[PDB]
């Protein structure tokens, strides 16, 4: 029942929904943050080519460099998810 809230996105609207969907399947399958992050990272490397990086958690800030149109930062329920492509 995890509510998706997109906080900042430089990414087509299709991929934003795809990102939320893939994160949804990751939370359905895994409970530990690194495992959720690896699931999203690997599926995006496959569906959208390398190189993606994913961070999952409830308390963190970041500063990253990313190809344009390949950045999303959203909440799925209480969990925050940063997904982006650099390289």
């Amino acid at each position: 029942d995890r509510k998706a809230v997109i906080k900042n996105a430089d990414m087509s609207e299709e991929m934003q929904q795809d990102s939320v969907e893939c994160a949804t399947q990751a939370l359905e399958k895994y409970n530990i943050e690194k495992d959720i992050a690896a699931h999203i990272k690997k599926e995006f490397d496959k569906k959208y080519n390398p190189t993606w990086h994913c961070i999952v958690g409830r308390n963190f800030g970041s500063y990253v460099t990313h190809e344009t149109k390949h950045f999303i930062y959203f909440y799925l329920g209480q969990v925050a998810i940063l997904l982006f492509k650099s390289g």
Partner: peptide, 12 residues
């Protein structure tokens, strides 16, 4: 073509 971005979580 790259670009720099911040993120921060909600306060808890």
């Amino acid at each position: 073509p790259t670009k720099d971005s911040y993120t921060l979580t909600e306060e808890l």
